[PDB]
Design a protein around this ligand. Structure first.
Ligand SMILES: CCCCCCCCCCC(CCCCCCCCCC)(CO[C@H]1O[C@@H](CO)[C@H](O[C@@H]2O[C@@H](CO)[C@H](O)[C@@H](O)[C@@H]2O)[C@@H](O)[C@@H]1O)CO[C@H]1O[C@@H](CO)[C@H](O[C@@H]2O[C@@H](CO)[C@H](O)[C@@H](O)[C@@H]2O)[C@@H](O)[C@H]1O
Ligand SMILES: CCCCCCCCCCC(CCCCCCCCCC)(CO[C@H]1O[C@@H](CO)[C@H](O[C@@H]2O[C@@H](CO)[C@H](O)[C@@H](O)[C@@H]2O)[C@@H](O)[C@@H]1O)CO[C@H]1O[C@@H](CO)[C@H](O[C@@H]2O[C@@H](CO)[C@H](O)[C@@H](O)[C@@H]2O)[C@@H](O)[C@H]1O
Ligand SMILES: CCCCCCCCCCCCCCCCCC(=O)OC[C@H](COP(=O)([O-])OCC[N+](C)(C)C)OC(=O)CCCCCCCCCCCCCCCCC
Ligand SMILES: CCCCCCCCCCCCCCCCCC(=O)OC[C@H](COP(=O)([O-])OCC[N+](C)(C)C)OC(=O)CCCCCCCCCCCCCCCCC
Ligand SMILES: CCCCCCCCCCCCCCCCCC(=O)OC[C@H](COP(=O)([O-])OCC[N+](C)(C)C)OC(=O)CCCCCCCCCCCCCCCCC
Ligand SMILES: CCCCCCCCCCCCCCCCCC(=O)OC[C@H](COP(=O)(O)OCCN)OC(=O)CCCCCCCCCCCCCCCCC
Ligand SMILES: CCCCCCCCCCCCCCCCCC(=O)OC[C@H](COP(=O)(O)OCCN)OC(=O)CCCCCCCCCCCCCCCCC
Ligand SMILES: CCCCCCCCCCCCCCCCCC(=O)OC[C@H](COP(=O)(O)OCCN)OC(=O)CCCCCCCCCCCCCCCCC
Ligand SMILES: CCCCCCCCCCCCCCCCCC(=O)OC[C@H](COP(=O)(O)OCCN)OC(=O)CCCCCCCCCCCCCCCCC
Ligand SMILES: CCCCCCCCCCCCCCCCCC(=O)OC[C@H](COP(=O)(O)OCCN)OC(=O)CCCCCCCCCCCCCCCCC
Ligand SMILES: CCCCCCCCCCCCCCCCCC(=O)OC[C@H](COP(=O)(O)OCCN)OC(=O)CCCCCCCCCCCCCCCCC
Lengths: 74, 670, 75, 494, 81
């Protein structure tokens, strides 16, 4: 035989509801909202990493040697 | 499908754990078992795609760590070794989820337990599917964290707290050596993906190979509980029984063995690491086999039998025989999990007693449990044509088949280990089932014989067998323990078998011994284990239930008493480790906190300065008497001192010495 | 006792007294043969040993791209 | 107006609003704390905007403002990759530190908020100034507010703690100042783009190294110069502790990348064995004493000492991975020590009023949400993979090993001992029996506030532990500029 | 018997003998979620896997039915003579 799931989440007794301390607005909407927006903004940020620029030159130089096939031969 | 094997056990784990309140006990069991069983089917399909058709599969998703020369990806490689490892891990995990549905039916925390069971499975899969050393290390620590959580699952018990710390810390000692070995690979080769390391291994400096090889051997020792770093695994028996069968007997204890086999293309080019593997495995075989015969708890005997089989694998790896090491790993996982689950049946049947001294009878009470426990035991002792016969016995003759002194020596060593395997195998089955009842009435009191008058409808508890979920895995694992070795030896051994031609296992031709093992080994040494097995079983079975006083005479001799205690106390390693390592570190910290940080550092630092400078300040202030005649003399003496210093062209060092002297005097009161 | 009201705790006086001794133990350190020897060992000897070993092996070895026919030693 | 000046200006505006809003409305202190929190959110939003515009492979300082009005002491602001992540750490930590003290600060709330807002401006200015003497001015400016913060809001031993941190930091800093003034006299300024082109002679470098090192070893801190931290980090209010361990310890690390690597390369390479012996000794000694520390907040404070030893050894490795790993570890330490201080100085302390380990046991039974986050944080402290702590420890340790193998091998032993004290402390508090019999009342579990500051901190360590490229990609190009050395067939090309 | 426990303790994994009356409905949703994520992972795998040998036509290789690399090879190989 099993028991019904019990317990007070955030310590709120079953009769009452959660009371806001005043931090919830700025933290959920400002702090977390901005971080979520920034993450979406970061998907559209151009890649400016040294790796991306250096991989492209490395590929051309290894295309020059007999290592990588040239998509545009001569 | 290949990614779906990786993420499916993780998905079930997060539902069981982080949404247990939503699905409850039954929902958690349905989701986890379903998510593990489906993964197991895909693993069987994968074993055919990758192994039988020899098509390795590469998958890379996103980079993990990218710094100049190190590029580590979230990437997975499936090769013949990978799918070989996944078969025991997924099947036994599926049968241990199912077995737990019944075994832990009365535990109050089923959701958390099944979340841990599915999270361990996911970390094990990560460990064997990763295509680079560091991603494997994630699953290496992943299984270690899951092992710590499952050993401490009943966390209000102090002894299970001590055991969980032991498993976490001892494995971390081996993790430190594995990290330095990865550092040595990075330093020499520029990164740690498997293909790079194994393509460059024949050419790298031979001393570099030793440093890396020894480093990854020590990590293997801890995870596979070899004599140096073994103590955690016996203490890990404090967790619930299905944890022992799954984590500490069949899958996670084999991660060290997996590390050496996956590293075979590198460590083949180091005879030093191979020779250290060879002897380390042999020591572990006899060390644990001796200890297990003198254990009073059934789980502790079985844990030392796991340690002795894992030593046999490491021994085999030291003979450049990774395919035979892999064969034994797969076969052992089946029948050793059977023994653990059969033991769990006994422990359930007699109300959680775990001591041989309170068993007896039960042969008519647990007939199914006895049968599969007997089937598993004959596989463990490599009885002819059982599953364990095809793996262990080949390891032995392979040791002889390498006609070298070390190879002959380990053969003899592992033969004595085989002798005591038979001894404690007899000890378990006889003391549990075949002997007279050493336990109380309650275990054996049946309703057929009238004992009660008013409490007749209930109040009998006669130590019966378990339910379907408890017994179905036993039947399945019993079948693998009989036929699986015969069905599959041609894959793993063959004679010129090409199952591992994706280079999963590399055997350098100079390290081949298999021809001599098949043809050059004399027949006497081939059947010697069976002669010993069939005789010490007679010797053990006769010493009990027929003699039974001779062993007692030995025990009550001072020689025997000391022998009994030494092996029961596990060569006194836990005693000497606790005395001179653990307590040594605690006392070092005690000294540092008491004599230095809250001591000498305070006095030769801020606190000493505060004491002295307050004293110096008060003594100088004593000169300020406000007596105008005294200040007048002070001005005068200061005047003369300035006149002397300049007129006589005094050495500046004299002036500084004078000032220091004046502070000295003002240090002293009165 | 410290700002916000906390829960009732059976504050055991012996354990509290042990906690007070640990906070104030610096006030009672003295130089003895034992304390001087321990302090000298931890502060001078062991660090100077690691310092000497680090000094003498600085630049001794390099692993990068070392093949057979080469040495790990650089010096 | 530059975005970097906006970063320094927003908290000053919030200080002004907090101190004047009594004239436009007894104003509730909730209003004060709302103003300060929103002030920190906007500062974080600005730093996020800067990062979106920031370029990962530029060796020119970005978002700078031309002055053309030179004076004796002019504040020049600029950002590159080796400072951009410290700016982000400061603007993420500051709102969390404010919420962590939302209820536990009961008197002098206006003073508490103004100090924290002023601390935000001063710490940010440390990362953004482009002059070496400007670095000292901001590094030392945080001391009086820190002295007042400890003394107005600290625990029973707050006076001794406030004095220790002030006098230790001042004493070390005075030796750094003499080093900076010598540089200013030889070169004529301490502006980065001019001083970094100077080449000090070797003996000058040696005596410049000493004096900068003395200060950075007092601030790391190295073992033996760390009693100020064991006092101040414990006696501080919770928000003070988060700022002190997440950002203030990072000043000496970012200081190494500006004050030692480019201008003292020869002294740094010749003295690495002295740095490594101290860093190795600190790793072992701090680890053993952490194992015997019975104050829960002091134990989390002492583990900061052991972690900072590894980033200090990584920063002197003169290898790319060791330098990047040092920054990665610094950042990962900021999230983990913030979470462990919240767990101890904010959850245990608020509920019991005590910090002694002897009174805690079996908290998992009644506080499952606390034990879940506390455990994940204790794995981060042990450098468990999937946390940013493993990535930083591994890269830092690899660079230390490759620079000086014996020092790396000893430093590697931290993988064993950080696990020991993290797992030991977790087991004694969350596990280790049923609920402690010293608790008369039962305890509530995490409040929504406590849950969402721990969840946020735990989120950062795990997300960056799985995709650390989010920081490394913006580190690679700029951190190349602080490496010293040459390859024979790669150098002097023609 | 079953152990007593506090009813005020809220735990995400359920607590002590936790099974909601609607556990089958909730299990159905979560299993549906698990299928949906797994299918997405399956789609990713079948497109990003890499092989260097293809299976023979007569051998049991069910991945041939969804993996892009093999599907392209089999379709191209059907153009013979
Ligand atoms: C977990 C460890 C498991 C066990 C590891 C065993 C590994 C065995 C290799 C040991 C090794 C690698 C150390 C690299 C460490 C890298 C980072 C650490 C690991 C990072 C993960 C340390 O060797 C160093 O040791 C130094 C002293 O310690 C010595 O330097 C100086 O020593 C003193 C003055 O001589 C000064 O007093 C000291 O001040 C100096 O410095 C040198 O011997 C050397 O630099 C290299 O050993 C080498 O020694 C030489 C001489 O025999 C061998 O050459 C031989 O010479 C011919 C005739 O001679 C022989 O005919 C021929 O056979 C061979 O050509 C090599 O073949 C090899 O054997
Ligand atoms: C402890 C941290 C020091 C604080 C940083 C010092 C900043 C640089 C001053 C180091 C100093 C004296 C060091 C004396 C011992 C130091 C105290 C002893 C232990 C104190 C408890 C080096 O003075 C040495 O400089 C060498 C050349 O570099 C000369 O060779 C030496 O002859 C000369 O003595 C002064 O020289 C400095 O002035 C400039 C003038 O333009 C010189 O050009 C440099 O020389 C410069 O360095
Ligand atoms: C980190 C907390 C704030 C964000 C919380 C919510 C996001 C947490 C992660 C959840 C999963 C999100 C990605 C799911 C996988 C899909 C991949 C994807 O999104 O592609 C888009 C991109 C990948 O696109 P891409 O790889 O094709 O190209 C863009 C990348 N650059 C700019 C380099 C070219 O992934 C993301 O944008 C995810 C952003 C994660 C959050 C932002 C980074 C971490 C926070 C920065 C602060 C770090 C400093 C801390 C202090 C020091
Ligand atoms: C290179 C650096 C290497 C340094 C090697 C030695 C390490 C010493 C570090 C010194 C820097 C920190 C000193 C902290 C002293 C604070 C203290 O003692 O408590 C203050 C105390 C707090 O102690 P308390 O709180 O425990 O009890 C005193 C109670 N009240 C404050 C009410 C009196 O407050 C005081 O003002 C009393 C101090 C009286 C005068 C003591 C002055 C000592 C300062 C020495 C500095 C000298 C530097 C020369 C070098
Ligand atoms: C490494 C940092 C973390 C990264 C991973 C983040 C989690 C990813 C998902 C993990 C699998 C899902 C875990 C479910 C949680 C377990 C059950 C639960 O809810 O606990 C509450 C339970 C509630 O249990 P209960 O439901 O039985 O309630 C009654 C029990 N008491 C009496 C306690 C109330 O709390 C506990 O009892 C245990 C407290 C510790 C919780 C252990 C943490 C679990 C997660 C481990 C992270 C794994 C890291 C992997 C290693 C890194 C790889 C190198
Ligand atoms: C839920 C809601 C939560 C908050 C939502 C905001 C979260 C945003 C997080 C990510 C921001 C990305 C948006 C962005 O990219 O803005 C770019 C903006 C325009 O760029 P541009 O016009 O070219 O200005 C160049 C000046 N050098 O760049 C800018 O210049 C913007 C300037 C902002 C100045 C702020 C002034 C003080 C604000 C108080
Ligand atoms: C969790 C799984 C998240 C889904 C990951 C797959 C999504 C994807 O395709 O993003 C890949 C993207 C580009 O790949 P990249 O890292 O640049 O290099 C590839 C080298 N194999 O690289 C990325 O941006 C991956 C970012 C991973 C962030 C994981 C956060 C996990 C949060 C829990
Ligand atoms: C075999 C070789 C043994 C050589 C004999 C060594 C010896 O003299 O040991 C004697 C010791 C006697 O035991 P004790 O407890 O001292 O007797 C009390 C009498 N008042 O008895 C012993 O100590 C026997 C030691 C048995 C355990 C040794 C470890 C295993 C040895 C494997 C063989
Ligand atoms: C840096 C190393 C110093 C750290 C502290 C070392 C130390 O031992 O301090 C203790 C010393 C004596 O303290 P003590 O008098 O024994 O205590 C009071 C007992 N009733 O305390 C002292 O009295 C030390 C006094 C030092 C005074 C220095 C004055 C600086 C002026 C230099 C002049 C140069 C010409
Ligand atoms: C640069 C910007 C200016 C520096 C900061 C000055 C801030 C002064 C404006 C605050 C005016 C004010 O009214 O503050 C009142 C507050 C306590 O007063 P009140 O709230 O009315 O008391 C109620 C009792 N029931 O009192 C306070 O809030 C003051 C809190 C202490 C000030 C910060 C702690 C001192 C920091 C060191 C100060 C000296 C060095 C200056 C540092 C500047 C940065 C380098
Ligand atoms: C449960 C226990 C599983 C244990 C697995 C252990 C792995 C190692 C076991 C070794 C056994 C080898 C397999 C035995 C049967 C092999 C076989 O040939 O079965 C025939 C079947 C059809 O193959 P096919 O090539 O098409 O034959 C016609 C050719 N003209 O070939 C097949 O593909 C049939 C096998 C289907 C595999 C999927 C099974 C899902 C369950």
């Amino acid at each position: 035989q099993y028991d019904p799931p019990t317990g007070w989440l955030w310590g709120v007794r079953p009769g009452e509801k959660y009371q806001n301390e005043g931090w919830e607005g700025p933290f959920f909407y400002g702090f977390w909202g901005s971080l979520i927006v920034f993450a979406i903004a970061y998907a559209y940020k151009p890649d400016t990493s040294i790796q991306t620029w250096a991989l492209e030159e490395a590929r051309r130089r290894l295309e020059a040697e007999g290592i990588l096939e040239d998509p545009n031969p001569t | 499908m290949y990614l779906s094997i990786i993420i499916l056990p993780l998905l079930g784990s997060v539902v069981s754990g982080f949404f247990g309140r939503k699905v409850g006990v039954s929902g958690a069991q349905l989701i986890t078992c379903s998510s593990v069983i489906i993964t197991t089917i895909l693993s069987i399909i994968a074993f055919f795609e990758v192994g039988f058709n020899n098509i390795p599969v590469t998958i890379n998703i996103f980079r993990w760590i990218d710094s100049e020369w190190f590029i580590i990806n979230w990437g997975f490689q499936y090769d013949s070794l990978t799918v070989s490892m996944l078969i025991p891990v997924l099947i036994i995990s599926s049968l241990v989820h199912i077995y737990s549905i019944s075994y832990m039916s009365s535990d109050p925390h089923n959701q958390r337990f099944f979340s841990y069971l599915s999270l361990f499975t996911f970390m094990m899969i990560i460990l064997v599917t990763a295509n680079n050393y560091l991603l494997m290390f994630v699953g290496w620590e992943g299984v270690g964290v899951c092992s710590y959580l499952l050993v401490s699952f009943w966390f209000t018990r102090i002894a299970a707290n001590q055991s969980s710390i032991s498993a976490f810390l001892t494995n971390r000692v081996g993790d430190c050596f594995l990290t330095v070995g990865m550092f040595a690979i990075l330093w020499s080769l520029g990164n740690l993906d498997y293909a790079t390391v194994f393509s460059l291994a024949p050419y790298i400096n031979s001393n570099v190979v030793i440093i890396i090889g020894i480093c990854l051997l020590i990590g293997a020792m801890a995870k596979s509980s070899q004599v140096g770093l073994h103590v955690w695994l016996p203490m890990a028996m404090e967790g619930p029984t299905p944890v022992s069968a799954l984590i500490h007997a069949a899958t996670m204890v084999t991660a060290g063995v997996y590390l050496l086999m996956r590293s075979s293309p590198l460590i083949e080019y180091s005879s030093t690491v191979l020779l250290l593997c060879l002897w380390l495995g042999a020591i572990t075989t006899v060390f644990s086999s001796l200890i297990g015969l003198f254990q009073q708890d059934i789980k502790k005997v079985i844990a030392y039998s796991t340690m002795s089989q894992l030593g046999m694998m490491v021994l085999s790896i030291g003979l450049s025989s990774y395919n035979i090491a892999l064969f034994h790993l797969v076969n052992h996982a089946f029948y050793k999990a059977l023994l653990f689950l059969g033991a769990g049946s006994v422990i359930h049947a007699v109300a959680d007693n775990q001591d041989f001294r309170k068993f007896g009878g039960l042969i008519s009470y647990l007939p199914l449990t006895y049968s599969v426990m007997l089937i598993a035991s004959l596989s463990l002792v490599a009885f002819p044509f059982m599953t364990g016969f095809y793996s262990k016995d080949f390891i032995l003759e392979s040791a002889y088949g390498q006609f070298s002194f070390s190879g002959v020596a380990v053969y003899i060593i592992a033969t004595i280990g085989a002798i005591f395997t038979t001894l404690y195998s007899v000890k378990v089955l006889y003391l549990t089932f075949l002997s007279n009842p050493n336990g109380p009435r309650t275990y054996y009191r049946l309703a057929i014989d009238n004992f009660f008058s008013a409490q007749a409808i209930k109040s009998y508890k006669p130590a019966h067998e378990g339910d379907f979920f408890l017994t179905l895995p036993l039947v399945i694992l019993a079948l693998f323990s009989i036929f699986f070795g015969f069905i599959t030896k041609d894959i793993f051994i063959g004679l010129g078998s090409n199952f591992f031609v994706d280079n999963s296992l590399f055997i350098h031709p100079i390290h081949e011994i298999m021809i001599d093992t098949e043809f050059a080994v004399p027949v006497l040494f081939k059947l010697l284990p069976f002669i010993f097995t069939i005789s010490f079983s007679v010797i053990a079975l006769t010493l009990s239930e027929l003699l039974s006083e001779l062993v007692i005479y030995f025990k009550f001799s001072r020689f025997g008493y000391n022998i009994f205690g030494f092996f029961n106390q596990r060569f006194l390693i836990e005693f000497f480790y606790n005395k001179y390592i653990t307590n040594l570190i605690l006392n070092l910290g005690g000294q540092i906190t008491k004599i230095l940080d809250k001591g000498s550092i305070e006095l030769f630092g801020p606190y000493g300065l505060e004491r002295g400078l307050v004293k110096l300040s008060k003594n100088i202030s004593s000169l300020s008497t406000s007596h105008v005649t005294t200040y007048a003399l002070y001005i005068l003496v200061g005047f003369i001192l300035y006149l002397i210093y300049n007129n006589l062209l005094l050495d500046y060092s004299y002036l500084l010495l004078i000032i220091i002297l004046l502070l000295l005097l003002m240090m002293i009161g009165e | 006792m410290a700002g916000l009201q906390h829960y009732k705790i059976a504050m055991d006086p012996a354990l509290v007294r042990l906690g007070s001794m640990i906070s104030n133990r610096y006030k009672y350190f003295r130089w003895t043969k034992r304390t001087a020897l321990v302090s000298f060992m931890y502060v001078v000897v062991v660090p100077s040993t690691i310092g000497y070993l680090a000094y003498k092996t600085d630049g001794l070895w390099d692993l990068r791209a070392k093949r057979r026919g080469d040495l790990i030693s650089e010096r | 107006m530059s975005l970097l000046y906006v970063l320094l200006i927003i908290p000053i505006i919030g200080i002004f609003l907090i101190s004047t809003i009594d004239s436009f409305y007894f104003f509730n202190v909730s209003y004060y704390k709302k103003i300060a929190l929103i002030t920190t959110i906007l500062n974080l939003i600005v730093s996020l905007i800067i990062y979106i515009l920031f370029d990962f492979s530029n060796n020119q300082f970005q978002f700078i403002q031309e002055n053309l009005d030179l004076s004796f002491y002019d504040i020049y602001l600029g950002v590159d990759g080796v400072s951009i992540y410290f700016v982000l750490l400061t603007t993420i930590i500051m709102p969390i530190a404010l919420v962590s003290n939302w209820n536990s600060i009961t008197n002098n709330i206006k003073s508490y908020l103004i100090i924290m807002l002023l601390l935000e401006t001063l710490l940010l200015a440390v990362f953004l100034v482009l002059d070496v003497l400007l670095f000292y001015i901001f590094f030392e400016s945080i001391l009086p507010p820190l002295f007042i913060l400890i003394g107005l809001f600290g625990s029973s031993n707050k006076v001794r703690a406030s004095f220790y941190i002030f006098l230790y930091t001042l004493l070390g800093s005075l030796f750094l100042l003499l080093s900076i003034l010598t540089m200013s006299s030889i070169v004529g300024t301490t502006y980065f783009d001019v001083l970094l082109k100077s080449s000090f002679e070797y003996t000058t470098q040696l005596f410049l190294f000493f004096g900068i090192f003395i200060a950075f070893a007092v601030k790391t801190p190295v073992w033996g110069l760390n009693s100020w931290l064991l006092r101040a980090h414990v006696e501080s209010p919770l928000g003070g502790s988060i700022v002190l361990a997440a950002i203030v310890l990072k000043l000496s690390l970012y200081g190494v990348f500006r004050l030692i690597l480019p201008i003292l390369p020869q002294a740094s390479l010749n003295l690495t064995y002295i740095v490594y012996a101290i860093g190795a000794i600190t790793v072992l000694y701090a680890s053993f004493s952490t194992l015997r520390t019975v104050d829960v907040k002091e134990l989390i404070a002492y583990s900061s000492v052991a972690h900072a030893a590894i980033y200090l050894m990584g920063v002197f490795s003169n290898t790319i991975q060791g330098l990047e790993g040092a920054i990665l570890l610094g950042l990962a330490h900021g999230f983990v020590s913030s979470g462990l201080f919240i767990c101890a100085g904010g959850i245990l302390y608020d509920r019991t009023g005590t910090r002694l380990i002897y009174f805690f046991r079996g908290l998992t039974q009644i506080m499952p949400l606390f034990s879940l986050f506390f455990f994940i944080l204790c794995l981060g402290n042990a450098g468990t993979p999937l946390t940013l702590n493993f990535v930083g420890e591994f890269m830092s340790l690899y660079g230390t090993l490759e620079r000086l193998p014996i020092a790396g091998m000893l430093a590697s032993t931290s993988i064993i001992f950080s696990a020991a004290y993290s797992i030991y402390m977790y087991n004694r508090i969350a596990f280790g029996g049923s609920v402690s019999l010293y608790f008369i009342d039962c305890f509530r579990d995490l409040t929504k506030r406590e849950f969402f500051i721990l969840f946020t901190l735990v989120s950062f360590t795990v997300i960056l532990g799985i995709y650390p490229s989010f920081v490394l990609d913006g580190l690679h190009y700029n951190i190349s500029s602080v490496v010293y050395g040459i390859e024979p067939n790669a150098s002097y090309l023609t | 018997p079953k152990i007593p426990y506090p009813k005020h303790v809220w735990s995400p994994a359920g607590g002590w003998y936790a099974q909601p009356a609607n556990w089958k409905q909730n299990t159905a949703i979560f299993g549906l979620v698990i299928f949906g994520i797994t299918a997405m992972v399956w789609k990713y795998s079948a497109e990003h896997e890499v092989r260097h040998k293809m299976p023979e036509p007569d051998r049991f290789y069910p991945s041939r039915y969804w993996v892009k690399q093999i599907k392209d090879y089999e379709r191209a190989q059907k153009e013979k003579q």
